Design a protein around this motif. Structure first.
Motif, short mmCIF file in Angstrom:
data_model
loop_
_atom_site.label_atom_id
_atom_site.label_comp_id
_atom_site.label_asym_id
_atom_site.label_seq_id
_atom_site.Cartn_x
_atom_site.Cartn_y
_atom_site.Cartn_z
N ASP A 134 35.72 44.29 44.71
CA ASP A 134 36.71 45.59 44.39
C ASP A 134 36.47 46.46 45.79
O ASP A 134 35.60 46.88 45.88
N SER B 172 38.58 48.96 46.01
CA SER B 172 39.51 50.25 45.49
C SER B 172 38.72 51.41 46.20
O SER B 172 37.64 51.39 46.64
N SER C 18 37.39 54.15 45.02
CA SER C 18 36.14 54.68 44.53
C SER C 18 34.72 54.02 44.81
O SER C 18 33.72 54.39 44.24
N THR D 154 42.47 50.98 41.76
CA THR D 154 41.85 49.60 40.99
C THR D 154 42.90 49.16 39.97
O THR D 154 43.88 49.80 39.48
N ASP E 186 42.17 57.21 44.87
CA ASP E 186 41.92 56.43 43.81
C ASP E 186 42.33 57.41 42.64
O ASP E 186 41.98 58.74 42.68
#
Ligand SMILES: CC(=O)N[C@@H]1[C@@H](O)[C@H](O)[C@@H](CO)O[C@H]1O
Ligand SMILES: [Ca+2]
Lengths: 96, 48
Positions: free
Chosen positions: A20, A22, A24, A92, B29
């Motif tokens: 992952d 993304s 975050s 995500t 995000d």
């Protein structure tokens, strides 16, 4: 983690590591993800086939392989080098 | 001249609560709630 124990503890694998990247995961968790992926690669042998992919609103390979490879010393080195270059940016998307 | 000020007070409190439950995320995000609150910002903007 010894080669003989890992050989005798299970059968050959078809592993696909999905990382992952993304936004975050920026920070400590990205660094830990990189180290953990390297350590997981350290447990694979020449009968195992591995490839590492990443996703942030779009899924792509981390290196120049694009499919499962033999996971010998050279291919594992390439995968480790590619993994120690990923950055965290985006949204995500687990489905992709 | 109606008790129309209390409605605006309540909607201001609602706007403050909406601002409070927003969760800042790093590197562009987002989550579902943040997307939901962004649309709700038009409901407050038009009323004001
Ligand atoms: C963002 C970027 O340029 N990453 C690359 C990486 O993919 C490559 O494996 C490495 C060579 O070791 O050079 C750097
Ligand atoms: Ca995320």
């Amino acid at each position: 983690r010894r080669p003989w124990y890992i050989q005798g503890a299970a059968s050959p694998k078809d592993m696909l590591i999905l990382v992952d990247v993304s936004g975050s995961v920026s920070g400590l968790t990205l660094k830990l993800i990189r180290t953990s992926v390297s350590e997981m690669l350290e447990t694979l042998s020449d009968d195992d086939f591995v490839n590492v992919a990443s996703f942030n609103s779009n899924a792509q390979d981390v290196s120049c392989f694009q499919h499962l490879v033999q996971a010998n010393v050279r291919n594992k080195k390439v995968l480790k080098d590619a993994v120690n270059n990923i950055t965290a940016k985006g949204i995500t998307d687990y489905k992709k | 001249w109606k008790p129309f000020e209390t409605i605006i007070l309540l909607t201001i409190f609602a706007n403050c609560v909406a601002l409070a439950v927003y969760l800042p995320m790093p590197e562009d995000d987002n989550n579902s709630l943040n997307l939901g609150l962004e649309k709700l910002e038009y409901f407050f903007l038009t009323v004001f």
